Amino acid sequence: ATAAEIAALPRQKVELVDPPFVHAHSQVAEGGPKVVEFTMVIEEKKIVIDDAGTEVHAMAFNGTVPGPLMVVHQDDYLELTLINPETNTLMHNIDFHAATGALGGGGLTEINPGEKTILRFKATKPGVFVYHCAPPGMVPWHVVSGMNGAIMVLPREGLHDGKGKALTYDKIYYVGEQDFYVPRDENGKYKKYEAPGDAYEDTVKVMRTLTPTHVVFNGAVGALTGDKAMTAAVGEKVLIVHSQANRDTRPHLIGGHGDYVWATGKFNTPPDVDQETWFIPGGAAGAAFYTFQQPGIYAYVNHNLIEAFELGAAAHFKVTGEWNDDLMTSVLAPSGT
Amino acid sequence: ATAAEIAALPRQKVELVDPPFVHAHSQVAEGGPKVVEFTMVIEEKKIVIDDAGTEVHAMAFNGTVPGPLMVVHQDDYLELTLINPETNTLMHNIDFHAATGALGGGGLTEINPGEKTILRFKATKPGVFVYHCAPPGMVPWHVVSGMNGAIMVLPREGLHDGKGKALTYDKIYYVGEQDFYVPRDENGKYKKYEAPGDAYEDTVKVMRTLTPTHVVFNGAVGALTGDKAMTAAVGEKVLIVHSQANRDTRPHLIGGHGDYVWATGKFNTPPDVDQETWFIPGGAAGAAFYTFQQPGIYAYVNHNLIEAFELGAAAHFKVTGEWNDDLMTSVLAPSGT
Amino acid sequence: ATAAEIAALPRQKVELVDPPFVHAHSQVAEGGPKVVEFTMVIEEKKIVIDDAGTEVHAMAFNGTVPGPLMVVHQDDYLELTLINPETNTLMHNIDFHAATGALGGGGLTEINPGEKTILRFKATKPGVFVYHCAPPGMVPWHVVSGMNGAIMVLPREGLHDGKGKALTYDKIYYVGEQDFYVPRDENGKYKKYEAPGDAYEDTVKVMRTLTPTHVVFNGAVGALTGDKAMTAAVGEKVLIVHSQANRDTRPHLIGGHGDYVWATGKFNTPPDVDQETWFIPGGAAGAAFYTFQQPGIYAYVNHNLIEAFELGAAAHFKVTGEWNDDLMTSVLAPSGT
Ligand SMILES: [Cu+2]
Ligand SMILES: [Cu+2]
Ligand SMILES: [Cu+2]
Ligand SMILES: [Cu+2]
Ligand SMILES: [Cu+2]
Ligand SMILES: [Cu+2]
């Protein structure tokens, strides 16, 4: 499109929504290409990540770990205002894996405390994609401090299966998975630090072991379990976007499947089908579409079950509706022999 | 199908055999849906997993690690009678990744020692699938004590390539790969215990390192080597099902290929072809079809070669037949320069 | 077919070049099947892998880590003369994942110092494939000492996308990724040894932790940076072949994508498209095709960002040409809030 064309496109501001929920959007694009505008303030803040009071100095886009899902359509532009307040201690930036050029945007968005920047890019490829902070020389420390999220660039005609038939979800959830590396003293007690930088050398030591101390969804052990379970009903179609900016994961819905899974995250790559456990490499997002058929509790886990049930990578779904005895039935309930 | 329709279907009782062998079955289904009946008794027992006498308190479906492969066809019902004898010490259950509802069956099959249960589920999706025990609060401990196996839900038509041409094996094997986490004392010797619960806390400590002490096929170092090799002949078509319920693996046939690999394990996802090394994420099963072209010894490994050749994840195939010098030949045998 | 027929085929003697470059070849085969001849001399040699001066006794095909890329076309024959000079200490051999029979060639090419051998195999499957040394009882030690490389078996008609459209690259690089396991003294400084075998025991104890101390491209931290950065231009089509003979990797071009990615490395498996981060399991090679659209610096990394930026797995590209503000622009450069 020529210059004048780009400048005349509609601009639209969107209010973000914290994970695992997602801001207002339409599956099939509304109108032609537009510039979708978002604002995020970076917050450096201590968070508690487990039920032992373990602390991390999180580096949080929009104040959450993960950062929020932004949704646009292919060939829209994403225009982000990124703000680094003067109460923060570090420079930050942003790298969108959906974008082309300048290290994903990281070369154009280095903001010290007290600065802001506005980056625009054309979302030329459809898929879910990671975004993360990447300051030169300190890239993994920011990412493993929680400074990452995802976007979704929907096809203009919405999602389709591998034969081109529409796939239209009723609900979407975004599960960001975070590996944390929390230092411990010689008694095995997690350490606490006054300011983010005080932890840098001890944290890189743990990072070099390649073994996280915690692997969590939505920023903390248990953040999406119990009273915080996600919800659905029998018959509803749910899209589950999952990202992991630094380390591999292998999602699984305990009691369900991924009926269609873009395991690479990219919508022009046909989805796998009927999956039990899919694989999302570190540095990527994936998305799974499932129609719920049975009510009750499900878990949603990274299926290294030690990561899920010892280190924190487990969520719940609570599903309403009527039980299907064709699909499963207890012929003889547990009883004495 | 209605409850009465299911009650009228034919029943077939299968006798399971121990991995890496597979029970008798037909690739193409005979006739219409059936209720395929299986029984497994759970055995808690010490197993020795290496040549140094290292022990695991195994929790073994049908007394083996992995548990046996169960074979059905799409839209059959799998009816399992699961028995937990009074000689065991723990509650157990079963979660079938092929099933829909109640945590794969785990919510309906919780059996204390001295109980049994009967679960039926409809095998609605074709593929190879993990099953495993998953008692609330104790899930990865049971799995990494060997309490896992797989099933195969064949298409009613049998297997096909990505162009719907039939693929018919002459032979099938089931390789269950197991990560074990064995505690060591201050001198580096593996510890022994006299009841499963006595090893729990020390085991969990090793599990949280994410670093197995052993990675084995069929429950031990060397289980599928030497005179317990898998066997085949030149011209024979072989399907190798491989599962890993907790940790990723990357199978490779040394000297061969995966001609067709359903690396996700799901038969409605078209297979990869001409594979050197495929990838099966923790929590899944995959399957590889190969036609042997050369005789001699092959190795079948997890191609993290430290996991294969230091930790235990290596099997052999012995193949009969005539050498093909067109495919390969020693032009000059090793000799002085 | 027969010996008369194979004697009649043309021979082509190729001179290998050092990675990341690739010897001259034709993407579409010039004429009928040929016997493509290569020679490699194995060198046991001390190499320095980081700016601290850390050393590995490398075991290097052609003197480099990785070994060089050999390029043939499907149904050519690859005929390798492999020489183990008398100045080396160990027996070595070669196992081509591209080849069929005798453990990939391993069984036929065991040469002591002062010996040579010539192996010929038919390259029946198109793709990129790992090769590596594999002496029985010492397999992972040789591979993780750098004794591995890759070959490319091009379709005779050159590369195509999943739908039959030709994909012709303008240039090709070969990135070999190497996990090294270097012992450390009680100060945590890397140890040095006199001969390869002096480090064996201490190296095996690091290998069994499954945690490399360094993960590098082209044999050292920073090897593909600075005057050794890869290069391209806006509009240029680049194929990046990447291998890892022992351990998984997840390549990512920072600021770009993989437009077409044969993540399994096999050209009869249609490529994934629009990739952010692809996944190549240990024991495999993959290849990604990308048309550069923006000038400037890029990094090409294993996107476990601790592996990339702490352990060494980061290369650079320098790209010339004109910035595209439609793809990306800084609407407001970093500036005061
Ligand atoms: Cu940051
Ligand atoms: Cu990134
Ligand atoms: Cu159990
Ligand atoms: Cu499971
Ligand atoms: Cu060697
Ligand atoms: Cu190999």
Side-chain angles (χ1 to χ4, degrees), chain A residues 95-97 103 130-134 139 143 245-246 282-284, chain C residues 252-255 276-277 301 303 305 309:
Chain A
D95 172 350
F96 286 94
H97 289 190
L103 303 169
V130 161
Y131 67 83
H132 60 87
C133 179
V139 174
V143 176
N246 188 61
Chain C
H252 180 101
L253 180 66
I254 310 184
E276 69 190 303
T277 301
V301 300
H303 211 292
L305 295 168
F309 292 115

CSV table of all heavy atoms in Angstrom, one decimal, chain A residues 95-97 103 130-134 139 143 245-246 282-284, chain C residues 252-255 276-277 301 303 305 309, ligand 2:
chain,number,residue,atom,x,y,z
A,95,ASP,N,10.5,-7.4,22.0
A,95,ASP,CA,10.7,-8.2,20.8
A,95,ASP,C,9.5,-9.0,20.5
A,95,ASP,O,9.1,-9.9,21.3
A,95,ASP,CB,11.9,-9.2,21.1
A,95,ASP,CG,12.2,-10.2,20.1
A,95,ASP,OD1,11.6,-10.5,19.1
A,95,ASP,OD2,13.3,-10.8,20.4
A,96,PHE,N,8.8,-8.7,19.4
A,96,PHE,CA,7.7,-9.5,19.0
A,96,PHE,C,8.1,-10.5,17.9
A,96,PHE,O,8.6,-10.1,16.8
A,96,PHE,CB,6.7,-8.6,18.2
A,96,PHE,CG,5.9,-7.6,19.1
A,96,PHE,CD1,6.3,-6.3,19.4
A,96,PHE,CD2,4.7,-8.1,19.7
A,96,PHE,CE1,5.5,-5.4,20.1
A,96,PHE,CE2,3.9,-7.2,20.4
A,96,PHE,CZ,4.3,-5.9,20.6
A,97,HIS,N,7.9,-11.8,18.3
A,97,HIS,CA,8.3,-12.8,17.3
A,97,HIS,C,7.4,-12.7,16.1
A,97,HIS,O,7.7,-13.2,15.0
A,97,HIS,CB,8.1,-14.2,17.9
A,97,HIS,CG,9.2,-14.6,18.9
A,97,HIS,ND1,9.3,-15.8,19.3
A,97,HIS,CD2,10.2,-13.9,19.4
A,97,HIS,CE1,10.4,-15.9,20.2
A,97,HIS,NE2,10.9,-14.7,20.2
A,103,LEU,N,15.4,-6.9,15.3
A,103,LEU,CA,15.4,-7.9,16.4
A,103,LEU,C,14.0,-8.0,17.0
A,103,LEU,O,13.8,-8.0,18.2
A,103,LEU,CB,16.4,-7.5,17.5
A,103,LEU,CG,17.9,-7.3,16.9
A,103,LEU,CD1,18.7,-6.7,18.0
A,103,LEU,CD2,18.4,-8.7,16.5
A,130,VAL,N,5.2,-15.6,20.5
A,130,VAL,CA,5.7,-15.0,21.8
A,130,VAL,C,6.1,-13.5,21.5
A,130,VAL,O,6.5,-13.2,20.4
A,130,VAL,CB,7.0,-15.9,22.2
A,130,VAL,CG1,7.9,-15.1,23.2
A,130,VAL,CG2,6.4,-17.2,22.9
A,131,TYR,N,6.0,-12.7,22.6
A,131,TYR,CA,6.7,-11.5,22.7
A,131,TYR,C,7.5,-11.5,24.0
A,131,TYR,O,7.1,-12.1,25.0
A,131,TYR,CB,5.9,-10.2,22.6
A,131,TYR,CG,4.9,-9.9,23.7
A,131,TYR,CD1,5.3,-9.3,24.9
A,131,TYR,CD2,3.5,-10.3,23.5
A,131,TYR,CE1,4.3,-9.0,25.9
A,131,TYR,CE2,2.6,-9.9,24.5
A,131,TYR,CZ,3.0,-9.4,25.7
A,131,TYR,OH,2.1,-9.0,26.6
A,132,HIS,N,8.7,-10.8,24.0
A,132,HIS,CA,9.4,-10.8,25.3
A,132,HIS,C,10.3,-9.6,25.3
A,132,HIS,O,10.7,-9.1,24.3
A,132,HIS,CB,10.1,-12.1,25.6
A,132,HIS,CG,11.2,-12.4,24.5
A,132,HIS,ND1,12.5,-12.0,24.6
A,132,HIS,CD2,11.1,-13.2,23.4
A,132,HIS,CE1,13.1,-12.5,23.5
A,132,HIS,NE2,12.3,-13.3,22.8
A,133,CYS,N,10.8,-9.2,26.5
A,133,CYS,CA,11.8,-8.2,26.6
A,133,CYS,C,13.2,-8.8,26.3
A,133,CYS,O,13.3,-10.1,26.5
A,133,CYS,CB,11.8,-7.7,28.0
A,133,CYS,SG,13.0,-6.4,28.5
A,134,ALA,N,14.1,-8.1,25.8
A,134,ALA,CA,15.4,-8.6,25.3
A,134,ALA,C,16.4,-7.5,25.3
A,134,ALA,O,17.0,-7.1,24.3
A,134,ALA,CB,15.3,-9.2,23.9
A,139,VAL,N,19.3,-10.7,28.2
A,139,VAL,CA,18.1,-11.2,27.6
A,139,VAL,C,17.4,-12.3,28.5
A,139,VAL,O,16.3,-12.2,28.9
A,139,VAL,CB,18.3,-11.7,26.1
A,139,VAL,CG1,17.0,-12.3,25.6
A,139,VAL,CG2,18.7,-10.5,25.3
A,143,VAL,N,13.6,-12.4,30.6
A,143,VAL,CA,12.6,-13.3,30.2
A,143,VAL,C,12.2,-14.2,31.3
A,143,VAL,O,11.0,-14.4,31.6
A,143,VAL,CB,13.0,-14.1,28.9
A,143,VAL,CG1,12.0,-15.2,28.5
A,143,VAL,CG2,13.2,-13.1,27.8
A,245,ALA,N,8.4,-18.7,26.6
A,245,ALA,CA,9.4,-17.9,25.9
A,245,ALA,C,10.8,-18.4,26.0
A,245,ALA,O,11.7,-18.0,25.3
A,245,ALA,CB,9.3,-16.5,26.5
A,246,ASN,N,11.1,-19.4,27.0
A,246,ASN,CA,12.4,-19.8,27.2
A,246,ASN,C,12.6,-21.3,27.2
A,246,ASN,O,13.8,-21.7,27.1
A,246,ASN,CB,12.9,-19.2,28.6
A,246,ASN,CG,14.3,-19.5,28.8
A,246,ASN,OD1,15.2,-18.9,28.0
A,246,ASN,ND2,14.7,-20.2,29.9
A,282,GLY,N,10.5,-24.1,23.6
A,282,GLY,CA,10.9,-22.8,24.2
A,282,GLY,C,11.1,-21.7,23.1
A,282,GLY,O,11.8,-22.0,22.1
A,283,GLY,N,10.5,-20.5,23.3
A,283,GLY,CA,10.5,-19.5,22.3
A,283,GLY,C,9.3,-19.5,21.3
A,283,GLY,O,9.4,-18.9,20.3
A,284,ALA,N,8.2,-20.2,21.7
A,284,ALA,CA,7.1,-20.2,20.8
A,284,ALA,C,5.8,-20.3,21.6
A,284,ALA,O,5.8,-20.5,22.8
A,284,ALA,CB,7.2,-21.5,19.9
C,252,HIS,N,15.8,-20.1,16.1
C,252,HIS,CA,15.0,-18.9,16.0
C,252,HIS,C,15.9,-17.8,15.4
C,252,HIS,O,17.0,-17.6,15.8
C,252,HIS,CB,14.5,-18.4,17.4
C,252,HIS,CG,13.7,-17.2,17.3
C,252,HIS,ND1,12.4,-17.2,17.4
C,252,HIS,CD2,14.0,-15.9,17.2
C,252,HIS,CE1,11.9,-16.0,17.3
C,252,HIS,NE2,12.9,-15.2,17.2
C,253,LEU,N,15.4,-17.2,14.4
C,253,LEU,CA,16.1,-16.0,13.8
C,253,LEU,C,15.5,-14.7,14.4
C,253,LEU,O,14.3,-14.4,14.1
C,253,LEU,CB,15.9,-16.1,12.2
C,253,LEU,CG,16.5,-15.0,11.5
C,253,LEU,CD1,18.0,-15.0,11.6
C,253,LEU,CD2,16.1,-15.1,10.0
C,254,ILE,N,16.2,-14.0,15.2
C,254,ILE,CA,15.8,-12.9,15.9
C,254,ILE,C,15.5,-11.7,14.9
C,254,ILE,O,16.5,-11.2,14.3
C,254,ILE,CB,16.7,-12.5,17.1
C,254,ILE,CG1,17.0,-13.6,18.1
C,254,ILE,CG2,16.0,-11.3,17.8
C,254,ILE,CD1,17.8,-13.2,19.3
C,255,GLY,N,14.3,-11.3,14.8
C,255,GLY,CA,13.9,-10.3,13.8
C,255,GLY,C,13.4,-10.9,12.5
C,255,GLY,O,12.9,-10.2,11.6
C,276,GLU,N,8.1,-19.2,13.9
C,276,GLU,CA,8.9,-18.3,14.8
C,276,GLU,C,10.1,-19.1,15.4
C,276,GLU,O,11.3,-18.6,15.3
C,276,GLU,CB,8.1,-17.7,16.0
C,276,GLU,CG,7.6,-18.7,17.1
C,276,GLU,CD,6.6,-18.1,18.0
C,276,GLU,OE1,6.9,-17.1,18.7
C,276,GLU,OE2,5.5,-18.7,18.2
C,277,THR,N,9.9,-20.3,15.9
C,277,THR,CA,11.0,-21.1,16.5
C,277,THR,C,10.6,-22.5,16.2
C,277,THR,O,9.5,-23.0,16.4
C,277,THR,CB,11.0,-20.9,18.1
C,277,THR,OG1,11.1,-19.5,18.3
C,277,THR,CG2,12.0,-21.7,18.8
C,301,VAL,N,19.6,-18.1,17.1
C,301,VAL,CA,19.9,-18.6,18.4
C,301,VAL,C,19.2,-20.0,18.6
C,301,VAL,O,18.2,-20.2,17.9
C,301,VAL,CB,19.4,-17.7,19.6
C,301,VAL,CG1,20.1,-16.4,19.5
C,301,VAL,CG2,17.9,-17.5,19.6
C,303,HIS,N,16.6,-21.1,21.1
C,303,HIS,CA,15.7,-20.2,21.9
C,303,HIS,C,15.4,-20.8,23.3
C,303,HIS,O,14.4,-20.4,23.8
C,303,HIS,CB,14.5,-19.8,21.1
C,303,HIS,CG,14.0,-18.4,21.5
C,303,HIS,ND1,13.4,-18.2,22.8
C,303,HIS,CD2,13.9,-17.3,20.8
C,303,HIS,CE1,13.0,-16.9,22.8
C,303,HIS,NE2,13.2,-16.3,21.7
C,305,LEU,N,16.9,-19.4,25.9
C,305,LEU,CA,17.8,-18.2,25.9
C,305,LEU,C,18.9,-18.2,26.9
C,305,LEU,O,19.9,-17.5,26.7
C,305,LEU,CB,16.9,-16.9,26.2
C,305,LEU,CG,15.8,-16.7,25.1
C,305,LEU,CD1,14.8,-15.7,25.6
C,305,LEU,CD2,16.4,-16.3,23.7
C,309,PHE,N,22.4,-17.4,25.4
C,309,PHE,CA,23.2,-16.2,25.8
C,309,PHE,C,24.1,-16.4,27.0
C,309,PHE,O,25.1,-15.7,27.2
C,309,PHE,CB,22.2,-15.0,26.1
C,309,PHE,CG,21.6,-14.5,24.7
C,309,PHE,CD1,20.3,-14.7,24.5
C,309,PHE,CD2,22.4,-13.9,23.8
C,309,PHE,CE1,19.7,-14.3,23.3
C,309,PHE,CE2,21.8,-13.5,22.5
C,309,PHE,CZ,20.5,-13.7,22.3
D,2,CU,CU,12.7,-14.4,21.2
